[PDB]
């Protein structure tokens, strides 16, 4: 009931559910941007619920290079993101 | 001039066919291996991509860049980047090249390796230049654009050996044969009905006396004469694949004497 999620670079605000990896590569929307190398268990998508963390990292055995980040809405209106890595 | 004897039979800007005569197989094969593996040469080995709206990916492009052969006659006078005291690269250890392309035309615009601009100071050592061997002087096709598409890059070239990656190899194929008749019985010929009808005669047989059916096998003979043919890709002229080849060995061996001395 507005118990919402938000793409956004998170930080450490009194709940801190964050990840064993870096958020240092996301932009202010919470999304790497094409061109950047990624790796390790690097975060690729930043997300939140103050701070219940909903944020995706690169598969542990993988590394590559962001290639496209694509953002849209669903039929039902949800912002989607899709990131492809190469 | 006593010792290992030479005998060119053909030569061309691109190949040199010859006969080594009075040497061991080992030295002959070793010089083959050196020509393939260890003659220094210059090659794009870092590429920074400012823009690429191309239909290829960057590493796809980069890889192709490291393969364009680049002039390398003066490569003794470029230091290995790892030996140089600069931070990273500089003019003593590196040529830097640029590439910009934009699909200005409606029709499809190709990017070739002549579109490569050197941007660093050569000190008038003949190195760096994209090599060009086609009638139209385009050299290699790197990419293709559509109207609106862009590619901007820089590259750094660096001296390197094919051990490390084959892009640094000056040689292409190296023909190498010996004992065309089979007189040495180093090989035993597979056949259905007749070994001689069924295997083709080498071109190198004319050069060498057929054996005579009586002739009981020669146990003492050794492999003393080698029909070679070295083919160059062009970053180094040919004669120079050989001579820097011979020269690279001779230095490997000397680093061994130098290191006995240091014991």
């Amino acid at each position: 009931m507005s118990i919402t999620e938000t793409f956004e670079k998170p930080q450490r605000t009194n709940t801190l559910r964050m990840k064993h990896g870096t958020y240092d590569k996301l932009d202010d929307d919470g999304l790497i941007a094409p061109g950047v190398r990624v790796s390790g268990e690097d975060v690729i998508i930043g997300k939140t619920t103050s701070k219940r963390d909903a944020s995706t990292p690169l598969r542990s055995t993988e590394n590559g290079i962001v290639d496209q980040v694509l953002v849209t809405t669903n039929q039902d209106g949800l912002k989607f993101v899709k990131v492809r890595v190469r | 001039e006593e010792g290992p004897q030479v005998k060119i039979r053909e030569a061309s800007k691109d190949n040199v066919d010859f006969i080594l005569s009075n040497v061991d197989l080992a030295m002959a094969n070793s010089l083959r291996r050196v020509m393939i593996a260890e003659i220094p040469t210059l090659a794009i080995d870092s590429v920074e991509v400012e823009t690429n709206t191309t239909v290829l990916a960057d590493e796809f492009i980069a890889h192709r860049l490291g393969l364009i052969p680049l002039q390398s006659m003066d490569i003794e006078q470029l230091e290995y980047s790892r030996d140089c005291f600069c931070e990273d690269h500089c003019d003593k250890c590196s040529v830097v090249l640029t590439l910009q392309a934009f699909g200005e035309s409606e029709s499809t615009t190709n990017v070739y390796s002549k579109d490569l601009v050197i941007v660093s100071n050569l000190m008038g050592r003949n190195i760096g230049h994209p090599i060009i061997q086609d009638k139209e002087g385009n050299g290699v096709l790197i990419c293709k654009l559509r109207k609106g598409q862009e590619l901007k890059l820089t590259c750094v070239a660096k001296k390197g050996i094919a051990k490390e990656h084959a892009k640094w190899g000056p040689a292409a194929a190296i023909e190498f044969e010996y004992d065309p008749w089979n007189k040495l019985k180093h090989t035993d010929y597979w056949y259905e009905q007749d070994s001689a009808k069924e295997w083709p005669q080498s071109k190198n047989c004319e050069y060498e006396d057929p054996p005579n059916e009586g002739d009981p096998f020669d146990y003492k003979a050794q492999a003393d004469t080698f029909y070679m043919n070295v083919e160059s890709v062009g970053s180094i002229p040919v004669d120079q694949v050989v001579v820097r080849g011979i020269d690279t060995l001779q230095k490997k061996v000397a680093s061994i004497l130098l290191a006995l001395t240091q014991m």
Partner: protein, 64 residues
């Protein structure tokens, strides 16, 4: 996707031969093998290179 720059096996440059090969077929009407031998691609390793390339980039370039 594009002509590869060299023969995977022998290193010979071959990426400067694609436009010519295709000119030698369509403009001067040779059969594929006579054409390859004219560009000096005489071992079967290099011949396989040009003869079996597929220029997929020509399809990729039709997208906007």
């Amino acid at each position: 996707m594009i002509v590869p720059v060299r023969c995977f096996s022998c290193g010979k440059v071959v990426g400067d031969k694609w436009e010519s090969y295709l000119n030698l077929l369509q403009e001067d009407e040779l059969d594929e093998g006579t054409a390859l031998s004219r560009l000096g691609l005489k071992r079967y390793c290099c011949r396989r290179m040009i003869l079996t390339h597929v220029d997929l980039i020509e399809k990729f370039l039709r997208y906007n």
